[PDB]
Amino acid sequence: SYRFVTFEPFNVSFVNDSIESVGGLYEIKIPTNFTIVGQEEFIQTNSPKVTIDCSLFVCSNYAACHDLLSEYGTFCDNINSILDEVNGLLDTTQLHVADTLMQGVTLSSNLNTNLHFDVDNINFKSLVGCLGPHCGSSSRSFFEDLLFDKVKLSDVGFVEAYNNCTGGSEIRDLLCVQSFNGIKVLPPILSESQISGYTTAATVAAMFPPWSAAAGIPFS
Amino acid sequence: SLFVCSNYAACHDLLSEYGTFCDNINSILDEVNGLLDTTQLHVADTLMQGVTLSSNLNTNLHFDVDNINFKSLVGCLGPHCGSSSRSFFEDLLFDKVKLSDVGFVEAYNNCTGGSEIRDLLCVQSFNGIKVLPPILSESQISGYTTAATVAAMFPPWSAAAGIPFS
Amino acid sequence: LLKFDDRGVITNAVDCSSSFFSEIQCKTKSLLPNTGVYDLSGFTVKPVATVHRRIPDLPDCDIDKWLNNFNVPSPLNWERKIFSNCNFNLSTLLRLVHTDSFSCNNFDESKIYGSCFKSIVLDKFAIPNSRRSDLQLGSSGFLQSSNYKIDTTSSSCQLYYSLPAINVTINNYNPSSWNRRYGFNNFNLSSHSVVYSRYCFSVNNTFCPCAKPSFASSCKSHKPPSASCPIGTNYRSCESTTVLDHTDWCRCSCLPDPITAYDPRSCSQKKSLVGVGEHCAGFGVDEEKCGVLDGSYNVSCLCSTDAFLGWSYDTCVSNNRCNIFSNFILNGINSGTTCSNDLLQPNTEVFTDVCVDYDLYGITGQGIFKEVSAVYYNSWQNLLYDFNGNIIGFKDFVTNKTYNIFPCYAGRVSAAFHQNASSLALLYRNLKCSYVLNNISLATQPYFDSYLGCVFNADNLTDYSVSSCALRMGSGFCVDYN
Amino acid sequence: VIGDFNCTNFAINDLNTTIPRISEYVVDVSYGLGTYYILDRVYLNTTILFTGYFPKSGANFRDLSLKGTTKLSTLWYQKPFLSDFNNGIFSRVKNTKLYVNKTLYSEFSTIVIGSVFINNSYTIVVQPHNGVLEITACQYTMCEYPHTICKSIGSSRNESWHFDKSEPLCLFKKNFTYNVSTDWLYFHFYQERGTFYAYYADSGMPTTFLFSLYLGTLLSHYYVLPLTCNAISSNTDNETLQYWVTPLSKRQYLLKFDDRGVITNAVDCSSSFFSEIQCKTKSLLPNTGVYDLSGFTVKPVATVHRRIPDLPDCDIDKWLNNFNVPSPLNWERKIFSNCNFNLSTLLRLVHTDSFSCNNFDES
Amino acid sequence: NAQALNSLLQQLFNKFGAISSSLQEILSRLDALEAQVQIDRLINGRLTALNAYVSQQLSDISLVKLGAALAMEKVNECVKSQSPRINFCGNGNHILSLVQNAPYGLLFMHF
Amino acid sequence: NAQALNSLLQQLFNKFGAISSSLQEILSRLDALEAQVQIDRLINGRLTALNAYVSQQLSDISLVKLGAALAMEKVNECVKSQSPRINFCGNGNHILSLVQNAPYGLLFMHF
Ligand SMILES: *[C@@H]1O[C@H](CO)[C@@H](O[C@@H]2O[C@H](CO)[C@@H](O[C@@H]3O[C@H](CO)[C@@H](O)[C@H](O)[C@@H]3O)[C@H](O)[C@H]2NC(C)=O)[C@H](O)[C@H]1NC(C)=O
Ligand SMILES: *[C@@H]1O[C@H](CO)[C@@H](O[C@@H]2O[C@H](CO)[C@@H](O)[C@H](O)[C@H]2NC(C)=O)[C@H](O)[C@H]1NC(C)=O
Ligand SMILES: *[C@@H]1O[C@H](CO)[C@@H](O[C@@H]2O[C@H](CO)[C@@H](O)[C@H](O)[C@H]2NC(C)=O)[C@H](O)[C@H]1NC(C)=O
Ligand SMILES: *[C@@H]1O[C@H](CO)[C@@H](O[C@@H]2O[C@H](CO)[C@@H](O)[C@H](O)[C@H]2NC(C)=O)[C@H](O)[C@H]1NC(C)=O
Ligand SMILES: *[C@@H]1O[C@H](CO)[C@@H](O[C@@H]2O[C@H](CO)[C@@H](O)[C@H](O)[C@H]2NC(C)=O)[C@H](O)[C@H]1NC(C)=O
Ligand SMILES: *[C@@H]1O[C@H](CO)[C@@H](O[C@@H]2O[C@H](CO)[C@@H](O)[C@H](O)[C@H]2NC(C)=O)[C@H](O)[C@H]1NC(C)=O
Ligand SMILES: *[C@@H]1O[C@H](CO)[C@@H](O[C@@H]2O[C@H](CO)[C@@H](O)[C@H](O)[C@H]2NC(C)=O)[C@H](O)[C@H]1NC(C)=O
Ligand SMILES: *[C@@H]1O[C@H](CO)[C@@H](O[C@@H]2O[C@H](CO)[C@@H](O)[C@H](O)[C@H]2NC(C)=O)[C@H](O)[C@H]1NC(C)=O
Ligand SMILES: *[C@@H]1O[C@H](CO)[C@@H](O[C@@H]2O[C@H](CO)[C@@H](O)[C@H](O)[C@H]2NC(C)=O)[C@H](O)[C@H]1NC(C)=O
Ligand SMILES: *[C@@H]1O[C@H](CO)[C@@H](O[C@@H]2O[C@H](CO)[C@@H](O)[C@H](O)[C@H]2NC(C)=O)[C@H](O)[C@H]1NC(C)=O
Ligand SMILES: *[C@@H]1O[C@H](CO)[C@@H](O)[C@H](O)[C@H]1NC(C)=O
Ligand SMILES: *[C@@H]1O[C@H](CO)[C@@H](O)[C@H](O)[C@H]1NC(C)=O
Ligand SMILES: *[C@@H]1O[C@H](CO)[C@@H](O)[C@H](O)[C@H]1NC(C)=O
Ligand SMILES: *[C@@H]1O[C@H](CO)[C@@H](O)[C@H](O)[C@H]1NC(C)=O
Ligand SMILES: *[C@@H]1O[C@H](CO)[C@@H](O)[C@H](O)[C@H]1NC(C)=O
Ligand SMILES: *[C@@H]1O[C@H](CO)[C@@H](O)[C@H](O)[C@H]1NC(C)=O
Ligand SMILES: *[C@@H]1O[C@H](CO)[C@@H](O)[C@H](O)[C@H]1NC(C)=O
Ligand SMILES: *[C@@H]1O[C@H](CO)[C@@H](O)[C@H](O)[C@H]1NC(C)=O
Ligand SMILES: *[C@@H]1O[C@H](CO)[C@@H](O)[C@H](O)[C@H]1NC(C)=O
Ligand SMILES: *[C@@H]1O[C@H](CO)[C@@H](O)[C@H](O)[C@H]1NC(C)=O
Ligand SMILES: *[C@@H]1O[C@H](CO)[C@@H](O)[C@H](O)[C@H]1NC(C)=O
């Protein structure tokens, strides 16, 4: 059953060739056929923003507890201040990421994004949201739909979960109990629809002229 | 269950109220060690990205080409690279300090049967504080560094952009 | 919050509890706080009604009729009467008996009125005057170590009172089957003489306080008395030897008594303690002093009355009123069928979908009831609990209707403040304006519904774009001032 | 011998007929054996750690169900049959079905619980009658050699296990019924602070509350009475009796509840490493990983006790009981060293009234 | 994040040596004299738990900021342009990259 | 690391206002009534020490992770190749670098 073995996760790839210069020449494997492959990578930029207060967590609605908490009120002020500066740092970081998504971006006004989307035989329909001139409601791309439907607890998920909390018949949910006990996850200062629009604008500027994000040259 | 209360029933019974602190402490240490293991795996992986060695590589005799001596930097000179691939250069480093992972293992081994009492590691280990070995041994990492160096050395020059070293 | 100028004159004052703006001023310790968003706590919804559920008419407990009985027992044999499924008045019970002191540990006086208990366990015995100080909590006296142990980790109440000296009889009867098996009759003591045990001894089932008659025949010097205890009992450990000046000297165990035995390890009877809720184990009988001389398999084992020893007695009389101890043992706190009626309140039917405080048969708190139809309650099963000690629903005693208990709303309110504006821009997050209006407070300011919740004192015009807001509430919505 | 009254002496053999067999059976708690319902608690679809009087997993059962036809051996009324009731026992009983004249007949063993088994100490008796469980507790005058018979088919002797011609004054007497067409019954019996408790179950392995009786004393020994029937041991082709008993202990249990509120599984939390992993994880099938288990101090194998040899007596009593007692203005003092003393004898010989300590205790 | 919030919520049901983990039972069983020491024990335990949580939150948010700075450099140097840094964007011979929005972060597809 | 472990070990011999720093003397001098408050003081002090130690360990391990990421970039950009970054590998005009294994880290020999 349980086999006790060695753990070798990495090893080199071997090539049968000589390692000496015969006739002034070495031996090496030059590739003769090629392909294009892809690979994804997720880097965490934002985190949920949590707020905790003493007047609900430590002492919920009891007068004696709230009166005894007045001695330790400096701890509560320090906790609230620390969480406030943490959330301020997170908001500043989100603003910096949103700004660095669009530095020298430049779009064309005559851009009806629903019909001209795949020139030079490359499909960007899945990567580019709000195909058309109606880019005011939701600019989320088809590619991001799989990401935002694979996980349901996004900021919109938190908003919809806290919304469905006052009137319901379910008691085993943890978010309602946490929110009633003073622990709550506030939405970020930029909605993910705006960030999706920023990424879409960056991708389109990389593709269509003037090629701002692709060093002023056709993509192919 | 060893540090706060060693083997006493009353202490362990009183600790049940603060058991959430102990679960949190063990969980925090577990995620810390998991992060360390992931970082070690990432370093080991980035030590070999486009590495490519030759099978006909009897490293005991061809070790100094182009009048440059890499015998001290390259371990397991020959075809017996299964036991210890530690280089001659790393011998000075691993003998200057004795408290490596092998040092910790050999120290904790010599703890049950002995006549010495002033050692601190045995007292710490009996009081619940123990330094576990990493998920990769330093012999494997020494072999990885040796493989990277030899890939920089000989054709195909994978770690040196496909060109002779000199 | 007070402000002083350079002359020491109070120029301004803040109520610190009148409104949200005053609370912001008092948290900031200033009068003109900087522009920012402030979170204000203390927003639990007030209850609108009260529901109080009691079991209908139960018979009277008559605690006074049992406490004022004329047959008061000893601490050696303390009585106990369990009370359940009855209603009692604590004030009338305390008043009618001639009480002197009534104090409790781990529980108090003021939380007994209007409270329910699963059962009330009461123990009663008379107090000898010599060991009056023995009944203090934590004291290891002769009463507490051999007659009645008082638990200190349970919510209990101690009651001291006295009955008139006449119309009092003392019941002396030791509850030791081991002592009764080997010839212990009733006591011979005067009236108002309270007997207490000083040492309690426990033996095995196979004890036999007599010597072997076959060995008794051979013993010629210091021959112990012999008899014939019934079968299954091992006899004494008497053995013969030579003491270098007698041809046959035979000694026995527990010389001369189990109290002052020089070798207690070989003695079968051992000195023992007494636990809570238990009587004395027995009285250490003198082995040698009791028995029949020259009894050879014809007389069953009996021992004299004076053989049993280790007890002394005193009187209860103090200013012609014999003092009596009582010990209330309250188990199953804030739950059960034994409830007090001093805080009299008529039974109120359970309301639905409104935040009310409840007193459902001893269980207190506030919550929201939503009646459902679920039949997982069995005959004994009556309350539904969460995985860690939380009530999440119950079933009524009389109507047998299943209910669920949901927590009331305890959210927070935001406040967007600008320096140039004396008003506030509130925001109740994740709520609808209809729920804020009728269930929380009425709106004296224009209110509108937004994505983040209901916004107060700020009109809804989310069409304009502002590239710089000092007051951000989240999800791309900011509250500027103009 | 369990009593002291000589009722009869018919059909008794004592010629060293030494074939006593005690069968064993491992205790499997992992499906609900030895678990009882809490008195007012409904848990649904959750996992709860609970402490209570429980049997220990990995231990062994004990088949005390004796069986005879005519003879009563003298080896049936001593140890290990007269077993040990220290804290409490958990019982598992087979329900023997007899088919006489196409009619079901349920009958099994009768258990008595007491301390000394005479008529000045109480004795809890449980005895079935064709589907009615008689649970009484009085000062029974039980015989030296007890006996139980078979109501479906009469044996060679009458029932004789007490000689109470008049009903003794006592406390508890009640009747209980159950589904007579069942296979196994489960019984929880334990005592706590002078009160005797009892739980019952017929259908389903989890147990529910039955009653609770106060006695004021402790319980010492219990014994399963032998049964005499003729249709049971008829050439060993018919059924038999199975009365399985295990001792109880106060250990933490992990319990699982389904949507109906029925206990489906249980974990011992102290039997083995796997149970400890399950109880730390609060699940029954933890994910694949490495777990560290503490509480691994090696138990001592011996004891060493060193004292200085024979020192003279201190005679603290001879100085305390001196007849020249001084004033608090000039209090005396005597320092004691290199001497042995007995605290109990010193406290006993002087006429003490109170003896209390600060920053130190009596024990 | 869900586990951290669940642990902080479960911190509310610890006795900390008091007779009950809930303030309601304490305030319904004791009256402002022996209630105060139990309430102080509960308050001290909950404040210690909150201080530990905010310290761990500070460390986690610092790590988040470092990862986001890495993401900003990744956007600047691999997507909008191609700096001559070997094995910075993706393993092997890199060509280009594209950026897509992700829940709490970005998604880079290195080709 | 040795000093941190030694300090954590020496934390076990602090009285924290109790009569003795060792549980054996307390359990041999007091019997479950006044012993409980001393044991509570010892438990609270040791738990505070453990929380401080794990917070410091979290900060130290975060610093170790940042240094290891620096080592990964040093391997990628100085050993295997030579990115045009002035004074990143070594002080002065850089030529190349080689990597050797070290106890708890790597050793870079810049030439
Ligand atoms: C309580 O239990 C005791 C102990 O068994 C009972 O005392 C015993 O009573 C029996 C009969 O009632 C006595 O047996 C008699 O013995 C004489 C001896 O000559 C014999 O001639 C009679 O025919 C009869 O068998 C027995 O001696 C007596 N004592 C002992 C030690 O066993 C007592 O009766 C019980 N009390 C009640 C109210 O049942
Ligand atoms: C060169 O220009 C021609 C324009 O005629 C491109 O041909 C079109 O390519 C698109 C693909 O985006 C097709 O949908 C059209 O049907 C093509 N039209 C014709 C007439 O062929 C061609 O793709 C361009 N070359 C490259 C490499 O993109
Ligand atoms: C050019 O090739 C010659 C091969 O003959 C190399 O000469 C050898 O160098 C090695 C040093 O690694 C010596 O051990 C041999 O003895 C040399 N052999 C001879 C015949 O000279 C020479 O080193 C090469 N040039 C360079 C710059 O490396
Ligand atoms: C004291 O207890 C009684 C019942 O045990 C409570 O009920 C009253 O009993 C008296 C006569 O005993 C009746 O005349 C009343 O009608 C009963 N009801 C009420 C509401 O008084 C009695 O209420 C208790 N005392 C208090 C103060 O509540
Ligand atoms: C609520 O449930 C209890 C428990 O069953 C009911 O009490 C008994 O119910 C059975 C059958 O349901 C009746 O035969 C008994 O007569 C009931 N006992 C008494 C003392 O009346 C109780 O009746 C139920 N309440 C209802 C139906 O209103
Ligand atoms: C809020 O108050 C500030 C402070 O008075 C206003 O700033 C002043 O505006 C007036 C009128 O435009 C100028 O004369 C002052 O020079 C301004 N002072 C400063 C320091 O800027 C501000 O305009 C007010 N309104 C808003 C929306 O901020
Ligand atoms: C508070 O809100 C609740 C529901 O959210 C209201 O309850 C319902 O209100 C509607 C509107 O009048 C009624 O038709 C229903 O009959 C109510 N249901 C119940 C069970 O009462 C409630 O009315 C609101 N509070 C106020 C004061 O209006
Ligand atoms: C808040 O204001 C916005 C902006 O006008 C409202 O959104 C409009 O709602 C109407 C009615 O449903 C629609 O016909 C428009 O198309 C919406 N416009 C936009 C830009 O969304 C919104 O309904 C207002 N909210 C409230 C509660 O009055
Ligand atoms: C009983 O509890 C189990 C475990 O929590 C529930 O099973 C989960 O059901 C949800 C459905 O919302 C799934 O998303 C989970 O993956 C399930 N988990 C497991 C472990 O099965 C089950 O639904 C609950 N039963 C009832 C009736 O509520
Ligand atoms: C409990 O039930 C049993 C069985 O019905 C009762 O035993 C019978 O009682 C009657 C008198 O009511 C006697 O005439 C029978 O001889 C008894 N049968 C047997 C087999 O002994 C028993 O009396 C009931 N107990 C109570 C307290 O009612
Ligand atoms: C080397 O690694 C490859 C891919 O991980 C694996 O298929 C191969 O078996 C390994 N060689 C070994 C472990 O000798
Ligand atoms: C490499 O290829 C040559 C030519 O076929 C062969 O002779 C030699 O054995 C090979 N070496 C290996 C497979 O290690
Ligand atoms: C390269 O591979 C593709 C498919 O993998 C094939 O169609 C093509 O002919 C190959 N070219 C060469 C030169 O091998
Ligand atoms: C509550 O409503 C939201 C829509 O805002 C929905 O996404 C969510 O699933 C609902 N919750 C439940 C339990 O149905
Ligand atoms: C214990 O044994 C190890 C070998 O595993 C050795 O390195 C170490 O020095 C020994 N300890 C002592 C104190 O000699
Ligand atoms: C006490 O007894 C006397 C004499 O028998 C009698 O007169 C008196 O009423 C009694 N007192 C009580 C309270 O019963
Ligand atoms: C009991 O006491 C009474 C009164 O003192 C006395 O007359 C009687 O003789 C005593 N009984 C015995 C058996 O000594
Ligand atoms: C009493 O019985 C216990 C077992 O219950 C046994 O361990 C002990 O040795 C016995 N003592 C005597 C004096 O018989
Ligand atoms: C017990 O009683 C039986 C008859 O009931 C009698 O035959 C026998 O002799 C008695 N045993 C004695 C007296 O030991
Ligand atoms: C059972 O009692 C009857 C009653 O007369 C009697 O005849 C019979 O012998 C008894 N059975 C015995 C003693 O085995
Ligand atoms: C009694 O138990 C049997 C066991 O299979 C079951 O079939 C029967 O339905 C039960 N009786 C009742 C009345 O439920």
Residue numbers in the entry:
A (entry chain B): 765 to 984
B (entry chain C): 819 to 984
C (entry chain A): 267 to 748
D (entry chain B): 14 to 376
E (entry chain B), F (entry chain C): 1040 to 1150
Question: What's in the article?
Answer:
Coronavirus spike proteins mediate receptor binding and membrane fusion, making them prime targets for neutralizing antibodies. The spike protomer can be divided into an amino- and carboxy-terminal region designated S1 and S2, respectively. Distinct S1 domains mediate receptor binding, whereas S2 comprises the fusion machinery. In HKU1 and OC43, attachment to 9-O-Ac-sialosides occurs through a well-conserved receptor-binding site located in spike protein domain S1A.
